[PDB]
Design a protein around this ligand. Structure first.
Ligand SMILES: *Cc1cc2c(cc1C)nc1c(=O)[nH]c(=O)nc-1n2C[C@H](O)[C@H](O)[C@H](O)COP(=O)(O)OP(=O)(O)OC[C@H]1O[C@@H](n2cnc3c(N)ncnc32)[C@H](O)[C@@H]1O
Ligand code: HEM
Ligand code: F3S
Lengths: 530, 117, 121
């Protein structure tokens, strides 16, 4: 009845829903199923625990980005190299995510119709609010009470309350808040258990969010892949989809995949859900091209792969005047949602700045030793606690406008092991973001002076935040879009896209929650038709 | 008197810690050297220079390595030890270590109890 | 029981390809809670399972029973719970872990659990 490609949070949910509805489902998974226990030990064994893709081996048949060292699986060109990362394995990229469950603020859903830049959504916030909550109820998300205004109107409160903040995050929260209320530093909404929830456990400050929770305390796509199989959904691990086949009713009738060997297989279904990631979903589309649709299925708009977006990050690291001991609790619980909105957003982009609660005794110890000067164990320890306690780091999400010149196309030369053309991404960062980062740097310098910073280091290199969006743009008409407001494709009735690719604007936050909601949206949609 | 007792008591001298696991100390030992003894020796010769007057330049480089081996837990870019890594237990009172839960949920609310102060 | 050290020499060594390696089963499935050595965190919470009752009984049916499902102590408007391992572990994976646990923590003599796992499901 329903054939879901990709077992990432997106597809996982869809499978589960229709699986519950008593519908026969097939979940197609490119990579293999890696169990919790195995992943952790790989990490615990890795020399660099700042490489969050390391403990996830890129299976030759289903390869993915790896920068330790560079496996160059991505062909990058343009002004800025789109060095993002995803995880091809049963459970999706939510295996290594930070579990930061943020809502898009109303104005995000009407950028051009308000600031006159980018593009509007075919839907408005109030349309996704009821689903937003259902997404917070399925994932299990803790978040502040009314007292803290997240500027996303809530019909109902969070299903869980947030555990106390880390001494580090509570100190810097108060320090800045009392300085300027405009910074508006608040408790971050996240999919972390503040109490035994969904049959899972509660956070115990493993401080390992990225690259992985060894308990399940926080949400991992796998949770629904499980619930999915238990509903009756037939999951096929190591089924890398490469082509989609159509019928005269410009409808999709089957999808073909290669197993570990490279042996092509065919899967026939009634409805199709393209639940691959931001780079992989457009690759399959720009790969299933036939005489019926020369420009590639659901690509009559020629917008498939285009309008690719991801928050160009910018951080700052310094040594505070006071001890903070980053590492006691989750990696991130604080977020400076001050410049998420405002008029200027018609000139430079709005950014969400987040304080780093990651252990730095790993890094700081190394930094001392790199000096290469011998010291007695009293002076050594002295510097270890002095450095690792006073270390603070601020990273932020910048918003880049959806641009058609930024695209993901299957390279017409390079190819993967099983011989599938590998993603060739052409990305560049407009001045719209450059100006925003400029003022974003003035906030960093101030945050320093407030927290009595020393050895203040500025990271002015736009870092990838791994939020691939806009590949299969959403719109009103099919001449400048790919899917409608129902996440359905204009070209193919029974083809649905459940990925950040459908998101017109990237906004100022992490998109996963937005994705999970849109997923549940379709679930009710597909559930009425079939 | 095996090339291991020398190392252990040479390590306690540099690390300034007592009760180091000889199980780890041997692994560090193996990795510090090759399949060789050239490293297993000169240890006694070092212990004398250290626990006395001035140290010869390249006699320092040897110490510095033994330190890193114990604290960082990685030698030649290979993880020999992570939990027992000495850098993680110098502010303890309750060991942190990334990938392991110290105490319980709310543990990170109140101010950490700085050690040797 | 007594502190393990079982993983003391298991760090840096690549993971095994096929076959139940009980030693690593505890490391990846547990440790992060009961800690590598099985000592359990200072402020009690998740207890040390080398001086526990269940860990070393005589007939460990009540032991594996926990590994399968977990615990749900809801008392004190601040409830606890050791999570589930019914869907993330096999009857053989569990039984082999149980034998390791008991043997290197409890009184291994009566430590059986030879595919009694399945019957407990
Ligand atoms: C890397 C990363 C990402 C991340 C993050 C931190 C890191 C280090 N922190 C986040 C955060 O704090 N908040 C947030 O909202 N997002 C955060 N992210 C990003 C997040 O992980 C992803 O945006 C999200 O998980 C995307 O989910 P989705 O379901 O859309 O897709 P996926 O998770 O990437 O899973 C894709 C699945 O599809 C399969 N696949 C891919 N290609 C194929 C083909 N050709 N055939 C078959 N299957 C395919 C993959 O195997 C996978 O199962
Ligand atoms: C993993 C393999 C694993 C095992 C095995 C295990 C065993 C275990 C036992 C035997 C007990 C005693 C409870 C009883 O009376 O039978 C016990 C208790 C707790 N556990 Fe546990 N446990 C394993 C894994 C985990 C994990 C991953 C956590 C938490 C993340 C966890 C926690 C707990 C807690 C808490 C208890 C007791 C609750 C309390 O003392 O407050 N366990 N476990
Ligand atoms: S990995 Fe685990 S329990 Fe807390 S901070 Fe990160 S979630």
């Amino acid at each position: 009845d329903v054939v879901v490609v990709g077992s990432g949070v997106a597809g996982a949910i869809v499978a589960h829903q229709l699986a519950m509805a008593g519908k026969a489902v097939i979940l197609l998974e490119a990579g293999p199923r890696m169990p919790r226990w195995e992943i952790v030990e790989r990490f615990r064994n890795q020399p660099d625990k700042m490489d969050f893709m390391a403990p996830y081996p890129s299976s030759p048949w289903a390869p993915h980005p790896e920068y330790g060292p560079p496996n160059d699986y991505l062909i990058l060109k343009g002004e800025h190299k789109f060095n993002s990362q995803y995880i091809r394995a049963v459970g999706g990229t939510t295996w290594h995510w930070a579990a930061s469950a943020w809502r898009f603020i109303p104005n995000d859903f009407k950028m051009k119709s308000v600031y006159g830049v980018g593009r509007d959504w075919p839907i408005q916030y109030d349309d996704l609010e009821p689903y937003y909550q259902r997404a917070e109820e399925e994932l299990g998300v803790w978040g502040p009470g009314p007292e803290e205004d997240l500027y996303s109107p809530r019909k109902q409160p969070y299903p869980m309350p947030p555990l106390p903040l880390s001494f580090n995050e509570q100190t810097i929260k108060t320090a800045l808040n009392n300085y300027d209320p405009k910074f508006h530093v608040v408790t971050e909404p996240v999919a972390r258990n503040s109490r035994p929830y969904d049959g899972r456990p509660t956070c115990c400050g493993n401080n390992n969010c990225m690259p992985i929770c060894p308990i399940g305390a926080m949400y991992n796509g796998i949770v629904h892949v499980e619930k999915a199989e238990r509903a009756g959904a037939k999951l096929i691990e190591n089924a890398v989809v490469y082509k989609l086949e159509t019928g005269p009713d410009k409808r999709i009738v089957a999808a073909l995949y290669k197993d570990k060997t490279g042996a092509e297989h065919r899967v026939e279904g009634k409805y199709f859900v393209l639940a691959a990631n931001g780079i992989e979903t457009p690759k399959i589309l720009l790969m299933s091209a036939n005489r019926d649709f020369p420009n590639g299925v659901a690509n009559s708009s020629d917008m498939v792969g285009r309008n690719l977006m991801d928050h160009p990050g910018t951080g700052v690291s310094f040594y505070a005047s006071e001890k903070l001991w980053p590492g006691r609790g989750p990696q991130e619980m604080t977020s400076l949602i001050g410049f998420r909105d405002g008029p200027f957003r018609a000139t430079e982009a709005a950014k969400k700045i987040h304080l780093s609660n990651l252990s730095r005794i790993d890094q700081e110890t190394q930094k001392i030793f790199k000096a290469g000067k011998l010291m007695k164990p009293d002076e050594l320890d002295a510097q270890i606690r002095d450095r690792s306690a006073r270390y603070v780091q601020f990273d932020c999400f910048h918003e880049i406008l959806p641009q058609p010149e930024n695209r993901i196309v299957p390279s017409k030369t390079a190819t993967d092991a099983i011989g599938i053309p590998r993603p060739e991404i052409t990305y560049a960062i407009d001045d719209y973001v450059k100006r925003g980062a400029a003022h974003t740097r003035e906030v960093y310098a101030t945050a320093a002076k407030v927290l009595g910073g020393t050895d203040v280091v500025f990271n002015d290199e736009f870092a990838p935040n791994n939020h691939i969006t806009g590949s299969t743009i959403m719109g009103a008409d099919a001449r400048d879009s790919v899917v409608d407001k129902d996440c359905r494709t204009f070209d193919h009735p029974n083809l649905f896209i459940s990925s950040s690719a459908t998101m017109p604007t990237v906004g100022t936050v992490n998109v996963t929650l937005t994705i999970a909601a849109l997923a549940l949206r379709m679930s009710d949609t597909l559930k009425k038709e079939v | 008197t095996a090339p291991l007792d020398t190392f252990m008591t040479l390590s306690e001298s540099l690390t300034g810690k007592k009760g180091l696991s000889r199980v780890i100390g041997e692994r560090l030992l193996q990795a510090l050297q090759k399949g060789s003894f050239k490293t297993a020796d000169s240890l006694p010769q070092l212990a004398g220079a250290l626990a006395s007057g001035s140290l010869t330049p390249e006699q320092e480089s040897l110490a510095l390595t033994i330190l890193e081996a114990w604290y960082l837990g990685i030698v030649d870019n290979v993880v020999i030890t992570y939990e027992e890594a000495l850098m993680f237990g110098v502010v303890s009172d309750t060991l942190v270590i990334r990938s392991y839960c110290p105490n319980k949920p709310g543990f990170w609310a109140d101010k950490p109890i700085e050690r040797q102060a | 029981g007594k502190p393990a050290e079982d993983g003391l020499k298991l760090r840096g060594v690549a993971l095994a390809s096929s076959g139940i390696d009980p030693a690593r089963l505890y490391l990846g499935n547990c440790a992060t809670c009961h800690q590598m050595q099985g000592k359990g965190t200072p402020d009690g919470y998740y207890p040390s399972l080398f001086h526990n009752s269940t860990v070393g009984a005589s007939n460990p049916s009540n032991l594996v029973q926990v590994i399968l499902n977990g615990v749900q102590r809801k008392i004190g408007s601040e409830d606890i719970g050791m999570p589930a391992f019914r869907y993330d572990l096999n009857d053989a994976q569990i039984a082999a872990l149980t034998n390791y646990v008991t043997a290197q923590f409890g009184n291994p003599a009566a430590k059986v659990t030879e595919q009694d796992v399945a019957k407990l499901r």
